[PDB]
Amino acid sequence: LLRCRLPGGVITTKQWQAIDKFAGENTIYGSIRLTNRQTFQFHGILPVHQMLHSVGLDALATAWDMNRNVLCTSNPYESQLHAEAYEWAKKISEHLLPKFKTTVVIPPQNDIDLHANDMNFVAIAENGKLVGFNLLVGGGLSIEHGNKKTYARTASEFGYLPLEHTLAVAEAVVTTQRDWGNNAKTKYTLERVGVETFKAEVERRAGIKFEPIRPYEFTGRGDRIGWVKGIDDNWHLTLFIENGRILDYPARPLKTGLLEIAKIHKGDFRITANQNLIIAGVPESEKAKIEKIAKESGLMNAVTPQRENSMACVSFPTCPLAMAEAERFLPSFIDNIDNLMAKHGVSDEHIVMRVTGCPNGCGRAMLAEVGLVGKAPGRYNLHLGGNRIGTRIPRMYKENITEPEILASLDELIGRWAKEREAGEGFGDFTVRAGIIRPVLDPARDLWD
Ligand code: SRM
Numbered sequence: 402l403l404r405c406r407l408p409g410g411v412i413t414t415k416q417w418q419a420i421d422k423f424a425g426e427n428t429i430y431g432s433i434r435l436t437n438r439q440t441f442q443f444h445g446i447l448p449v450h451q452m453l454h455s456v457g458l459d460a461l462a463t464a465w466d467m468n469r470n471v472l473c474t475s476n477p478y479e480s481q482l483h484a485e486a487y488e489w490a491k492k493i494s495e496h497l498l499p500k501f502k503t504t505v506v507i508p509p510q511n512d513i514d515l516h517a518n519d520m521n522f523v524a525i526a527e528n529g530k531l532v533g534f535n536l537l538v539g540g541g542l543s544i545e546h547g548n549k550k551t552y553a554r555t556a557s558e559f560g561y562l563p564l565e566h567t568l569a570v571a572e573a574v575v576t577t578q579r580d581w582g583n584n585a586k587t588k589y590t591l592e593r594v595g596v597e598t599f600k601a602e603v604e605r606r607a608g609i610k611f612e613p614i615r616p617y618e619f620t621g622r623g624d625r626i627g628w629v630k631g632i633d634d635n636w637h638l639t640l641f642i643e644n645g646r647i648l649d650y651p652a653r654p655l656k657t658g659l660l661e662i663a664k665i666h667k668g669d670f671r672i673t674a675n676q677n678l679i680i681a682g683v684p685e686s687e688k689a690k691i692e693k694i695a696k697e698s699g700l701m702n703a704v705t706p707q708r709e710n711s712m713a714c715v716s717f718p719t720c721p722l723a724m725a726e727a728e729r730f731l732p733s734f735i736d737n738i739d740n741l742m743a744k745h746g747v748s749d750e751h752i753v754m755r756v757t758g759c760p761n762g763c764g765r766a767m768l769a770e771v772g773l774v775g776k777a778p779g780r781y782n783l784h785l786g787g788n789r790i791g792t793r794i795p796r797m798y799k800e801n802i803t804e805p806e807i808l809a810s811l812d813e814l815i816g817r818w819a820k821e822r823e824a825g826e827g828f829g830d831f832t833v834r835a836g837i838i839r840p841v842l843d844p845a846r847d848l849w850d
Pocket residue numbers: 402404435436437438439440441442469470502514517518540541542543544586676713714715716719720721722761762763764765
């Protein structure tokens with residue numbers, strides 16, 4: 402199991418050129434696949450670690466290392482919090498070097514999908530200056546089909562810590578879960594021993610007491626597609642890449658385009674938790690040159706808001722655990738969803754819609770407004786009623802159905818939403834309000850009907 406350690410998704414252009422060369426020359430599939438944990442993967446490796454080491458990159462020792470890539474909000478609205486937040490994600494990543502998932506999140510963006518993760522540090526400021534974190538623990542999405550002893554769970558608030566406690570807290574949580582783990586994921590341990598019990602042990606091990614939670618709110622999980630103004634005279638260009646799959650396609654040489662950008666770009670790239678890529682820290686005067694290459698390579702091809710907010714996992718052909726197609730199904734599925742949105746006069750809207758190929762849940766369908774969970778070839782469980790910000794697990798609505806059945810249901814439901822929604826009301830929230838699906842309030846107890 403070759404995935405790269407790459408805290409916060411930050412990769413240099415020299416690193417990019419090396420992985421570009423390796424993917425094209427030394428793999429079956431020839432692609433770079435951006436993952437939804439802000440790193441990249443090669444598929445069908447035909448010297449890989451040698452390649453990574455040659456540009457300062459390492460791969461996680463999966464044989465024994467159960468930590469995974471540490472995420473950090475890629476493109477925060479307050480651009481000046483990124484540097485310090487990233488520094489901490491990197492320090493946490495390095496601290497955890499010898500499964501367990503960690504993020505650093507900058508409100509109001511939940512792009513990193515904190516509720517899918519064991520441990521989450523929510524940035525708090527005073528003065529455009531990072532001062533501490535709220536800690537939320539116990540998220541995780543994997544289930545086993547029909548097994549009511551498994552469940553997706555959101556993360557629970559433990560409390561606030563000043564920056565000086567970050568690494569000790571990180572170590573206390575990871576060791577407490579490893580130790581108390583049976584069903585051995587943090588989410589199960591937390592439910593078994595109780596939140597207060599786990600929290601008290603983390604406090605003991607880290608030598609701290611958590612302070613009261615400090616105010617935070619999330620407004621969305623999407624990337625900021627296109628150009629955004631950064632700090633000073635810098636600009637960030639986020640490129641939508643369908644499924645994060647970087648390969649040259651007819652009329653759309655995505656891989657060649659990114660290589661050419663890497664050769665002239667003065668800053669770094671950032672891989673996002675939505676499987677997209679940011680050309681980060683472009684000076685204003687270099688925007689036109691970068692945009693020209695991107696546009697000409699198909700990297701800036703316009704898609705609907707819906708497509709920008711849809712995601713799938715890898716699934717077939719490379720995943721040995723796959724039950725139904727996900728990545729390969731998504732583009733045509735979303736063509737069909739775009740048709741439904743247009744049919745109903747909501748083409749400018751979006752529904753956070755995700756497809757995962759089996760119930761392990763890598764595509765993060767169990768935090769979607771509409772989630773499809775693979776059950777068998779061509780068949781998915783349809784879940785409804787998550788929200789845009791990703792703080793609620795969607796209950797199963799229809800089990801083990803095919804694409805035409807899914808499309809007929811969504812036609813009806815999207816049609817109702819378009820006509821009946823309140824101002825700014827998301828599809829997921831609407832399905833709950835209209836009594837189409839019951840919400841999940843306490844997943845360990847009420848996820849399963
Ligand atoms: C690439 C990625 C999906 C994507 O399209 O982006 C992915 C791909 C796979 N995941 Fe994952 N997971 C990916 C994010 C996730 C996430 C979402 C997240 O972390 O944000 C989850 C759900 C959250 C969670 O962990 O609860 C996830 C939960 C799993 C699980 C279930 C673990 C569990 O708690 O039960 C497995 C199965 C296992 O470990 O036994 C798994 C196993 C796998 C494997 C390695 C299959 C395997 O064990 O042999 C997949 C390889 C497919 C392939 O051919 O590339 N992966 N996987 C993600 C890589 C992230 C990374 O860089 O590390």
